Structure formats: C-alpha cells, structure tokens
Amino acid sequence: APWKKIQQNTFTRWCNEHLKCVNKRIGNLQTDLSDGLRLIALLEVLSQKRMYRKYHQRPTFRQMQLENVSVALEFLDRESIKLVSIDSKAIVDGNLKLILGLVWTLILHYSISMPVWEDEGKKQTPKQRLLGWIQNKIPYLPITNFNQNWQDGKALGALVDSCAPGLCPDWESWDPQKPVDNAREAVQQADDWLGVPQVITPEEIIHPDVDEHSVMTYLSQFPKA
C-alpha cells in the first residue's frame, strides 16, 4: 500500500527543508535520525537555540546514540513541547510509527502553533488556527478539513491566487475532473512565486488516501512566508 507512506514522504521533505540550512539531509526517516545527530540539528534549526547539554559527535556505539536522542528529547521537554509517549530506544531502533509521531509534534509546534501569522483578528487548537487562516484567504469555499476539500485541486488554485492575484486567475473555471493537473499548476506556481516548497507532491495531495497531517504540513507553509 504505497499510498500509506505519503505521510513519511511529506514529513521527510519538511525535515529536509529545515536541515538544508545546516548542510544536512535525511534519505530515510526510519534510519537517519537513529544516531541522534540529524535530530539534534533539526531541533537547533527549528528553535534557533543550541543544545544545552554536551552530546557525542561521533556516536558509533549504541549507548552514545541513545544518549544523543535523550539530549534531544530533554531539549523538547525543556521547551514545553508536549511529546506523545516516546523514549530514545524507539528512535535509535527505528520505530517508524513513533518517529513519525515525533516529527508531527515538531511540525504542529514549530510550523502551526508557534509562528506569528499575518491575517489574524482565537483560543483554539493549531488545526482550528490553520483552518481559520486558510478560510479567510478563500471565503467562497467552505474549508473544514485537510483531505476531501483539497481533492479536486481547485481550492489549491483559489489559495495560490488569493496570495498573489494573477498566479491562478482562472481557478474557478478549472475542470474538477482534472485534479492532478489542477494541483500541479497551483503547487508549481506556489513553489515558483510564493516560496512554498513542494513538501507534498501534486499526486500525493489529491490522493484519495491522503492523510490530514501531510496536507497540514504543506499548507502550514503559506502563512509562514
């Protein structure tokens, strides 16, 4: 069921967008955080803070890897970031379910909850906040979810044009039976002119099995900048 890794793919691309700035990259989320170094780097970029505890720069041994991940998880507890049950061995041993959970916590926190957004005038969940911001941008479409509302590709057109009128001016006239073409046009225009990276692909975002977290990860880039 290759559709089931859309979230893994999307989370990996998001991580890489951040790791870019420190000349690092993840090829495989299941393995490439397990020594702790890329995780620590990612947290430093996200928080614009350095690790306060020392850690092992050449963690060739299992205990050093466990310790590296522990420093990272402590850092998160110290920043009042609520973590779902996770220990260092889950990361070190490549527990993909829990790794994806950890990365989601970071996306929700740093990309949705914490940032300062324009177009805001309010005691609500991060998902409500994101929905609210998007709904304000495209007030003529009912935006209540991060799956089915995005399936025909047209809401993407509407959002991109709302951000810069002229990018997708004819979105309302787009054929809803050409979802991949619609999505690809909107997403490329956003990439080319709005500085919004394709952390989800056009094919993934309109997939009937797309998960809300993957879509939220992409769309959270719009209010950021």
Curated annotation (Swiss-Prot):
Could you tell me which residues carry Phosphothreonine?
T201
This protein's superkingdom? Answer: Eukaryota
**Residues making up the signal peptide according to the UniProt record:** none
Q: Where is this region: Actin-binding?
A: 1-224
Concerning PTM, the database record says: ISGylation prevents ability to interact with the upstream activators of the JNK cascade and inhibits IFNA-induced JNK signaling. Ubiquitination by a SCF-like complex containing ASB2 isoform 1 leads to proteasomal degradation which promotes muscle differentiation.
Where does the Calponin-homology (CH) domain lie?
5-111, 124-225
Name the organs or tissues of expression. Ubiquitous. Isoform 1 and isoform 2 are expressed in placenta, bone marrow, brain, umbilical vein endothelial cells (HUVEC), retina and skeletal muscle. Isoform 1 is predominantly expressed in prostate, uterus, liver, thyroid, stomach, lymph node, small intestine, spleen, skeletal muscle, kidney, placenta, pancreas, heart, lung, platelets, endothelial cells, megakaryocytic and erythroleukemic cell lines. Isoform 2 is predominantly expressed in spinal cord, platelet and Daudi cells.
Associated pathology? Interaction with FLNA may compensate for dysfunctional FLNA homodimer in the periventricular nodular heterotopia (PVNH) disorder.
Q: How does it assemble?
A: Homodimer. Interacts with MICALL2. Interacts with RFLNA and RFLNB. Isoform 1 interacts with FBLP1, FLNA, FLNC, GP1BA, INPPL1, ITGB1A, PSEN1 and PSEN2. Isoform 3 interacts with ITGB1A, ITGB1D, ITGB3 and ITGB6. Interacts with MYOT and MYOZ1. Interacts with HBV capsid protein. Interacts with ASB2 isoform 1; the interaction targets FLNB for proteasomal degradation.
Q: What free text does the record give on domains?
A: Comprised of a NH2-terminal actin-binding domain, 24 internally homologous repeats and two hinge regions. Repeat 24 and the second hinge domain are important for dimer formation. The first hinge region prevents binding to ITGA and ITGB subunits.
Report the protein's function: Connects cell membrane constituents to the actin cytoskeleton. May promote orthogonal branching of actin filaments and links actin filaments to membrane glycoproteins. Anchors various transmembrane proteins to the actin cytoskeleton. Interaction with FLNA may allow neuroblast migration from the ventricular zone into the cortical plate. Various interactions and localizations of isoforms affect myotube morphology and myogenesis. Isoform 6 accelerates muscle differentiation in vitro.
Protein family (similarity comment): Belongs to the filamin family.
Q: Return the protein name.
A: Filamin-B
Which organism was this protein described from? Homo sapiens
